[PDB]
Every structure is written in C-alpha cells, then in structure tokens.
Design a protein around this ligand. Structure first.
Ligand code: GDP
Lengths: 499, 126, 165
C-alpha cells in the first residue's frame, strides 16, 4: 500500500524533486523493498522517473545495484507481466543514458539477451514494450557493436518491429537510426522489406523532421552498402518512388540542416548508383533549388559539403547551357570562399567546378569574364596552396587551372597571383604521382612568362623538368608534355639551355 | 560559494589512518605514497551546503617521508592519528609531522585522534 | 535571376497534371490518371532581357481532400492556381473549399494574400462571374487541357501579375 500510494502521488509532479531532497534514502528504501514480484511492480519502478534526475555518478551506483536487483526480479515476475517488464526496460533506458555505463551493461551481454528475449516473447503484439526495447537498441550502439549473432538477432527483431508497427514515431526514429548504423556494420529478400519500411516511414511522417532524417539516413546507408538494387527505386511499378519523397522532405524542412544533410547524401548515393536518375532531377528543377538552400544555410560547413557533393554527383556526365553556368558557378564560388578551411567542402567544390566548367561565342565570353571577375583564380590557388596534403584536391586544382589558362584573360591575373610558384611546389612535393606530373608539365609551358625566367634565372624550372622527365622516361605523354614545355621555355630565353 | 576542502590524515605506520578513513567515510596491508579520495558530505539538513572533502591518506612507513612535504599545503585540515597500543612513543613519532605542518601551514586546524583504544588502558590515555 | 514556387490545387481526376505537363513538358490531353503523391516540375520564362525567372509548379494531389492540408505545402510558397472541372458543381464546391483553406493557411511578407487564378479546365461564364467578383481573386480564365487553347496566355498573365508585386 505504501508503494501504491507513493506511485499515485508521484504522478502529480513537482513532488519528485522534494522526495529526492529528503533524508530517509527513498532510493535505498526501494532497493530494500525487493521476492514479492507484486513488489518492484508495486514500487512502480518510479526509479526511472527518479532516474530522470539522479546525477550521473549517483546514477552509476544506482546502475550496479539496479542491474542486479531488476534483472533477477524482472525476468521472473515480468516474463509473466507486461507492466513489470515494460517498467524494468524503461528504467534500464533511463539508467543507460551515461556513455560510461554501456560497457557495464555489456559485461556479459546480459542486456542484449534480455532485450532480445523481451522482443521475442514479452511483446508479440504490444506497442509500448516494443518502443521501449527499440529505444534501448538505439541507445546501445557504439564502437563495441561487434556482437555478430546478437547483431543478427537484434536486426531481425527491429525489422520485424518496424513492419509490425509503422504508425508511431516512437519506433521509427530509433529503429531506423540503429538500423542504419547496424547495416553499415553487418553488410561486410531483406532489401525489399527494408525499403518498404523506409518508404512508409517517409510517406506517413512527412511533418516530423527526426523520422524523415532517420529514414533517409537508413536508406542512404543501406544503398551505400548494397549497390545491387539501384534499379529497385523508381517511379515505375514494383519500385518504391523514394526519390520524390526525399526531395519533398528536403524542401518542406529546409530550415533544418540535419534533414538536408541526410537527404542530400541519400540521393547523391542514389545518383551515383544509377545514372538514369540524373537529368530527371534536373527536369524537376533541383540544382538551382539546392543552390538556394545552401544560400540559406551558409553558417555550417556540413550543409555546404553535402550540397557540393550533390552537385558533383548530379552534373557528372552531362553538358549544360551558359545560363546554367551563370546561375551555378557564382554560388559554388561563394560557398568555397566563405568556407576556406574545410578540406571536404573545398574538395567537393573543386570537383564540381571541374566537372561543370567544360551569338554563342559572345555569350560564353561574357560568362567566362563574369566567372573571372568572381575571383575564381584566387580561390582555387589559395585552396590548392594552403592545403598541401590530400593529393585529390591537388589533382582537382591542377585540372581546374588547366581549364582556366585557355580563357581569354587568364594569363595576366594568373601571373599576378603567383600561380607558377604553387605549381612548382606541387610538382616538388609529388614526384612519384603520374597525373600531377603530367598536368604540371603541361601547365608550366602554358603559364610561363619572361618574368619567370628573367635575367637568365630559372634553375628550379630546369631541375624539376629534368627530374620529372628522367623519373618517368617510358611514359610517352609525360615526355611529350615536358618537351613541349621545354621548347616553349627555350622560345623565350636561349640561356635556359645552359641550365 | 565553493564547498571543497582538502583533508590530510597523517601518522606513523599501523596507526589506523586507512581504517579510520573507511569508518568515517562509509586489504589494507599498506598505504603506499598518498591515497587521494573525495568525500561527499552533504549534511542531512539542507541548510548546510554539501562539502566535498579532498581526502589525502598519507603513508606511515618512513620510506615515503621524503616526498610527503611537497604535497603538504595550506588551505587544508589535518588529522594526527596516533596509536595507543604502542604506548607513548607515538607522541614522539608524530613530532616530524607537526614540524612540517607548522612549517608549511602555520594556521591550519590540527586534530589528534588517538585510535585503537579498545585495548589501551586509561593510565596510558591519561 | 529569380525563383518562384506555384502550388496547383483542385479536385481529383480533373487533369491536375495535364496543365503542368502541357505548360512544362509540352504534352496535352493524354490518358487521365490519379496522382499518387506530390510532384514537381520546372518552368523557365524569359520575361525580360537579362532577367530570367524560374518557376516550380507543385501539383498537389487532391485525393486527400478531407485530410488536413499541412501548412508545410504552403510554407514559403509564392503563388497559387485553382483548377476546377467545368462539368460538375461538386468541382466548384471543392475549389471553394481549397480557396477557403488557403485563405486560412497562407501568409505573405506584405500580409496580402498571394495572387489566385480561377482556371476552368476542360472547356457558362455568367455563373462563374458572381464568384469571380465575390471571391476577390486576381483573375479568371477558361481553358481546355486537351486543346491547350488558353493555358499559355493565362500563365503569362499570372506571372505578370505576380511580378507587379
Ligand atoms: N592494532 C590494530 N591495528 C589495526 C586494527 N585494524 C587495522 N589495523 C591496522 O592499521 C593499519 C592502517 O594504518 P595506516 O596508516 O594505513 O598504515 P600504512 O598503510 O602503513 O600507512 C592497517 O594496515 C591495519 O593492518 C586493529 O583493530 N588493531
């Protein structure tokens, strides 16, 4: 009767703080209360309600005592009792909040077996118990998740839970997040039901940001680790039309950066999987649309990186018009300029610009002049000079400069910025790579001027040219580019031959 | 306000410092070096702000005496556990500790808690 | 360079996709089917020299008429059009319902309602005149989805009216 009265009292609220500020150790009272089986259930397991505020170290002492008592009592009495099992599981959820306690709960994998058994038997067709257990599953994911057989069991349980209760947001968030992490884990039939669940999640919860983010993240991660079903998505019958749902989710919740990141990554993976989806999203008008969304979200680097990845995977293998160039290139240039320290953003923007840069002649000349006035050369040189590591950005920068040089006005600004020293340094730090050497040797003759070999001084030039040509003697292309560059240099000053 | 303080327990070996700390706060072959602990004392009355005593259980064996004065500082309270079964030589044994306490912390409370009295007689106590 | 979004509302099976495919993909008549979900289309108009405008047509599925029309459909939306089949008064009542719901669930930076166009698809103008004067809409225009007789002029007028603001 004391436990029942306490439980009904604590439903009032604003009293649990007073009860925790007492002196008779109500925590110790509840621990000492428990083999009644009716007891503990009688206690109302308001230990979870108390665990809402308990302070982490106090909560860890509570963890050792509670794990012992609750596991034994709950297993027997509650294997026969929905309320007891539910309360014990949700108290474990409240208890497992600290990051340090997960290893304690996986000391002998007792928690994993307990939740698996509860999902199997305790709640065959129960909603709240499954919601609590699935929240446990999501909360119990970390680097220590290499429990292969337990992984298979819990994956089956959570997938079954999603197909048996898809109308509530309690499951879908935790289930889909844990589902994405664990599918990334295990992938090193199922796919049809998985995407069915994901499509239902996107469709039935369009107003909830978290459900959409989790579901499209799960879709992205599954498609990332499973490339065989790229044809299983589409508007044609038998395929889930998830692309339109992803776009719609991104557009309704443009104010949230997380859903943007997840959805953009998802459809970028989808576009990389099959190229038929490209030029259909363009017909839907998403490129300038996502450009507008990155314009709205500029204070974060992750959103810009995801958008640049989307542009890179969207415009790959296609040719656009000059209007598209004038509408796209300045936005990417601004995004790269505002985010100068982030390596992924710079790399993705450079890749996109490279993939996208190359009456009609006058219009294109105007577009090139506008692009040049947008300080493209300064931005790309700063990006490839400040960041001497990550050779991929070096390849992208050399390719972009190579496309830049043959512009009408490229030479003067390129010489003023001092690109030549950057190219020479790039060649010095990357002797063994082939593409860097080829691009640099082709470029050097292109941007060489009389100032660079002024008064007969050009020793680093000769050193690098001879070293590059000698190291790669059999590669015909490298030798051809190097000898063309050398002839171009000799055309300027004959003294260079001596060097 | 900051309710935090360092508590120092010092004395010769076998005095009972570790056992006294266990009895107050709640395999003790030796206390090598210094044992550092935190004592959360929230007095039952909510008026008293919860103290967290930084307990520094010092060694008793003389091999560790050279490095002890480096960790003896002011802004702390000191205990002076002395065994009664040994007799009266414990008083002499605690003089080096009191010397270093005075040299390093001139104005700091000192409490002398004679332990192991269950065997000691009242004449020795007097 | 400017961006705008236009929401197409109406009843079901009244050629909601017909007008947007004729206006963007240049396909008229064709088989009439039901719309599973929200669909998007892109239109590019050269209204003025050195001033290019892009239009995103959202043709909302009318199957969920009884369902609560989420404000996220109309969030940040710039323009709208109401299309009703001229062969049923139930379509007219449905268009009234959509207009009332829009007036209840729309806002603008200036506070005035977004321009609306009463489009009579699949072509009784005197009967519609009373609601044209009473509802306070921007304009009224009839057209035929199969023939595409007046879609282009109506959309051009709507774009000009929007650019007037
Ligand atoms: N004579 C006596 N000694 C005790 C009793 N209980 C514990 N002790 C001893 O007291 C010691 C604690 O003294 P401590 O200051 O920690 O010595 P230290 O560890 O060498 O620095 C323990 O090692 C115990 O062996 C008791 O009842 N009587």
């Amino acid at each position: 009767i004391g436990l029942k009265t306490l439980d009904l009292l604590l439903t009032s609220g604003k009293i649990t703080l007073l009860i925790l500020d007492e002196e008779s150790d109500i925590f110790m009272l509840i621990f000492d209360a428990m083999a009644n089986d009716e007891v503990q259930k009688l206690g109302c397991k308001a230990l979870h309600v108390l665990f809402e505020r308990v302070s982490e170290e106090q909560l860890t002492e509570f963890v050792e005592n509670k794990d012992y008592m609750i596991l034994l009592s709950a297993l027997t009495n509650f294997k026969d009792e929905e309320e007891i099992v539910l309360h014990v599981l949700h108290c474990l959820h409240s208890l497992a909040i600290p990051c340090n306690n997960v290893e304690v709960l996986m000391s002998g994998n007792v928690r994993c077996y307990n939740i698996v058994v509860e999902a199997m038997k305790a709640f065959p067709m129960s909603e709240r118990i499954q919601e609590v257990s699935c929240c446990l599953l999501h909360r119990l994911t970390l680097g220590n998740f290499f429990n292969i057989l337990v992984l298979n069991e819990v994956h089956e349980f959570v997938v079954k839970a999603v197909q048996q209760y898809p109308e509530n947001a309690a499951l879908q968030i935790s289930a889909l997040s844990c589902l994405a992490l664990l599918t990334e884990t295990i992938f090193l039939e199922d796919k049809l039901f998985w995407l069915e669940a994901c499509y239902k999640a996107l469709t039935w919860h369009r107003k909830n940001k978290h459900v959409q983010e989790a579901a499209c993240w799960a879709l992205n991660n599954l498609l990332m680790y499973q490339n065989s079903l790229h044809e299983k998505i589409g508007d044609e019958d038998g395929h889930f039309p998830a692309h339109r749902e992803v776009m719609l989710s991104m557009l309704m919740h443009s104010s949230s950066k997380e859903v943007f990141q997840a959805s953009a990554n998802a459809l970028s993976t989808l576009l990389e999987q099959n190229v038929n989806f490209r030029k259909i999203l363009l017909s839907k008008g998403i490129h300038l649309n996502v450009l507008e969304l990155m314009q709205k979200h500029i204070h974060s680097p992750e959103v810009a990186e995801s958008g640049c990845k989307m542009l890179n995977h969207l415009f790959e293998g296609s040719n656009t018009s000059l209007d598209i160039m004038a509408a796209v290139v300045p936005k990417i240039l601004t995004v790269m300029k505002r985010h100068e320290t982030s390596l992924p953003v710079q790399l993705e923007a450079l890749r996109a610009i490279l993939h996208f840069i190359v009456e009609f002649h006058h219009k294109l000349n105007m577009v090139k002049k506008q692009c040049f006035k947008n300080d493209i050369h300064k931005l790309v040189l700063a990006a490839l000079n400040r960041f001497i590591g990550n050779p991929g950005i070096q390849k992208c920068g050399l390719k972009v400069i190579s496309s830049i040089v043959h512009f009408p006005d490229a030479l003067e600004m390129l010489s003023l910025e001092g690109a030549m020293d950057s190219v020479l340094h790039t060649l010095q730090m990357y002797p063994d790579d082939q593409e860097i050497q080829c691009l640099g040797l082709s470029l050097i003759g292109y941007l060489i001027t009389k100032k660079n070999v002024f008064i007969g001084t050009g020793h680093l030039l000769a050193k690098i040219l001879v070293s590059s040509l000698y190291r790669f003697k059999d590669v015909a292309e490298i030798q051809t580019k190097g000898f063309q560059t050398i002839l171009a240099i000799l055309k300027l000053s004959a003294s260079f031959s001596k060097l | 306000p900051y309710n935090r303080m360092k508590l120092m327990i010092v004395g010769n070996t076998g005095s009972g410092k570790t056992t006294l700390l266990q009895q107050l706060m709640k395999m003790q072959s030796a206390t090598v070096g210094i044992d550092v602990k935190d004592w959360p004392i929230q007095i039952r009355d909510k008026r008293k702000r919860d103290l967290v005593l930084n307990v520094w259980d010092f060694a008793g064996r003389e091999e560790f005496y050279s490095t002890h004065p480096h960790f003896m500082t002011q802004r702390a309270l000191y205990l002076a556990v002395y065994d009664l079964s040994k007799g009266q030589a414990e008083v002499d044994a605690m003089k080096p500790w009191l010397f270093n306490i005075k040299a390093r912390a001139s104005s700091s409370p000192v409490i002398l808690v004679g332990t192991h009295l269950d065997v000691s007689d009242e004449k020795q106590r007097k | 360079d400017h961006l705008f979004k236009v929401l197409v509302v109406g009843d079901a099976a009244v050629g909601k996709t017909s007008l947007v495919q004729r206006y963007s993909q240049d396909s008229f008549s064709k088989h009439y089917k039901s719309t599973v979900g929200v669909d998007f289309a892109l239109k590019v108009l050269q209204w003025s020299d050195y001033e290019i405008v892009r239009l995103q047509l959202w043709d909302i599925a009318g199957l969920e008429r009884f369902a609560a029309m989420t404000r996220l459909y109309y969030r940040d939306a710039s323009a709208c059009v109401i299309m009703f089949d001229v062969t049923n008064a139930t379509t007219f009542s449905n268009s009234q319902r959509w207009k009332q719901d829009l007036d209840s669930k729309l806002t603008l930076p200036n506070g005035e309602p977004v321009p609306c166009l009463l489009l009579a698809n699949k072509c009784s103008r005197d009967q519609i005149d009373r609601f044209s004067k009473e509802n306070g809409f921007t304009g009224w225009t009839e057209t035929s989805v199969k023939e595409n007789k007046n879609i282009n002029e109506a959309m051009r007028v709507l774009i000009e009216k929007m650019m007037r603001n």
